[PDB]
Structure formats: structure tokens, C-alpha cells
Write a protein that binds this ligand. Structure first.
Ligand SMILES: C[C@H](NC(=O)[C@@H]1CCCCN1)c1ccc(Nc2ncc3cc(-c4ccncc4)ccc3n2)cc1
Length: 245
């Protein structure tokens, strides 16, 4: 009957929205764990035309810093789209940030370079992420970055050139500037602290780097964050430009 229920054993709900869910499953035949995203779809609609288009791009990605795709299929039970991805054992970049990544200088710079390699690859293949945030970046068991989706305010990652009249591959690099700051800064457990500190970074005049973010031990980071967070997209580097720096 259901391909999902026949082939997989549900282990844990990783994510829940009113309009979608991510489940950790184990495939019965190969004994592997996967993350299976389930999304309700309308096949006689433009929403499904758009979803199928995204599934087409995703199925063509092949890089060590991109969450490995396995399958996608539809079940008529109401139509559901299932996307079977790799299961990343060490959860998301949000979890790393909140557990004090900033103190770990060698790891911090390795993870930023891995997000960069993933990003450069996606741009070289003419694609844009459009939702780059730490919850959408996963870490595997060997502590490697895998860029993913985790999609079920958060507009603090959205580039300024996303308005009526003002957006290419440089949208991802603005979001990257917010992420690298969060990665290079101490955890901001409280919402009010997060919305304040990060809105001060998106200021058109200058990205306000907090008082406890000094040019003593954060000079190399401050340069990269200020360059990526530049209001004028053309003034931002490319991912390869930041890699060959
Ligand atoms: C239960 C735990 N939860 C946490 O750690 C929470 C997370 C939120 C913040 C608080 N901490 C948790 C959650 C996920 C994973 N691993 C994992 N791996 C790969 C994934 C791939 C997709 C994907 C990619 C592309 N297209 C579609 C789906 C979605 C989710 C994935 N999740 C491991 C542990």
C-alpha cells in the first residue's frame, strides 16, 4: 500500500509544521537511517509545478558539503510528496552555535570554509539557496557541514535587495555573514538579545559589531563578516572569491 510505511520504520519526528514534517526513519532492507521530509501537494497546481522544479535541482546536486539526496516520490492516500535524504547524526549548525562554537577557532574556520565550498558549488551550478540559516545546515558524524532545507520573524537572514525594485547568488552571501557572526559570537539564548544584536548587523550605515566582539581576537572574522554583510551586493565577495582570499 504505502511505499513509506512498507519500506521504512519510523524512528523519531525531527520536524513538524502544520504544512509538513521530517521523520528519522530506518530503511528495512539496508538498515540505514534517513531523514524523510513529507509535504502535502496539489498536483493540479502551480505550487506542485514549483515543488517539482525544486526536486529537479536538488536531485542534480553532488558535493560533500550538501546533504546527500536519495529519493523523492508521491503517494495518493490527498497527495503527499516524500523526499528521502541522508540523516546527519550531529544535528544542525544552530545546535553547534548554541553550544559555544565561538570558543573553537580551528573548528569555526573549518565549518565556515565548508559552508563556503557548498555555496560555491551551488552557485557554479547556477543555483541559489534562498533560505540559508543555521537550522538548515547540518553536521554529520565526522563533523562535516551539509547544507540542507529543514523547511516546514526569521527575516534577519534575508538580504536587503529582496524588495520591490533593487537579486542573484549574493543573497546567500549576505545570509552567510549573519551565520558566521552567530558562529564567531557567544550564544544568544534569549530572543530579544538575538533580534537586537542581529538587527544592528543589518544597519545600512554600518554593521554594528557588539562591544564584546573586539578587534583583538576577532579581527580576521570582523573583516569577513563586514565584507559579506555589505548593503551593496556588488561590494560582497563570491564564495570562490572568499575561498581564494
Ligand atoms: C532531533 C534532533 N533535533 C535537533 O537537534 C534540534 C534541531 C532544531 C534546533 C534544536 N535542535 C535532530 C534533528 C535532525 C537531525 N538530522 C538531520 N539530518 C539530516 C536532515 C536533512 C533534512 C532535509 C534536507 C533537505 N531537504 C529535506 C530535508 C532535514 C533534517 C535533517 N536532520 C539530527 C538530530
Amino acid at each position: 500500500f504505502s511505499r513509506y510505511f512498507i519500506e521504512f520504520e519510523e524512528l523519531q519526528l525531527l520536524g513538524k509544521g502544520a504544512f509538513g514534517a521530517v521523520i528519522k526513519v530506518q530503511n528495512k532492507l539496508d538498515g540505514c537511517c534517513y531523514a524523510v521530509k513529507r509535504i502535502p501537494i496539489n498536483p493540479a497546481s502551480r505550487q506542485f509545478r514549483r515543488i517539482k522544479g525544486e526536486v529537479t535541482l536538488l536531485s542534480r546536486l553532488h558535493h560533500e558539503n550538501i546533504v546527500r539526496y536519495y529519493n523523492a516520490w508521491i503517494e495518493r492516500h490527498v497527495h503527499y510528496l516524500y523526499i528521502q535524504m541522508e540523516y546527519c547524526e550531529k544535528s544542525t549548525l544552530r545546535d553547534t552555535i548554541d553550544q559555544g562554537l565561538y570558543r573553537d577557532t580551528v573548528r569555526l574556520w573549518r565549518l565556515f570554509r565548508e559552508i563556503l565550498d557548498g555555496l560555491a558549488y551551488i552557485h557554479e551550478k547556477g543555483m541559489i539557496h534562498r533560505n540559508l540559516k543555521p537550522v538548515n545546515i547540518f553536521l554529520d558524524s565526522d563533523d562535516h557541514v551539509k547544507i540542507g532545507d529543514f523547511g516546514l520573524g526569521t527575516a534577519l537572514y534575508v538580504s536587503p535587495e529582496v524588495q520591490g525594485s533593487t537579486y542573484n547568488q549574493k543573497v546567500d552571501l549576505f545570509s552567510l555573514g549573519i551565520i558566521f557572526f552567530e558562529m564567531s559570537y557567544h550564544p544568544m539564548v534569549t530572543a530579544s538579545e538575538r533580534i537586537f544584536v542581529l538587527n544592528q548587523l543589518r544597519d545600512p550605515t554600518s554593521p554594528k559589531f557588539p562591544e564584546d566582539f573586539d578587534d583583538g581576537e576577532h579581527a580576521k572574522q570582523k573583516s569577513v563578516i563586514s565584507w559579506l554583510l555589505n548593503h551593496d551586493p556588488a561590494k560582497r565577495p563570491t564564495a570562490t572569491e572568499l575561498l581564494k582570499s
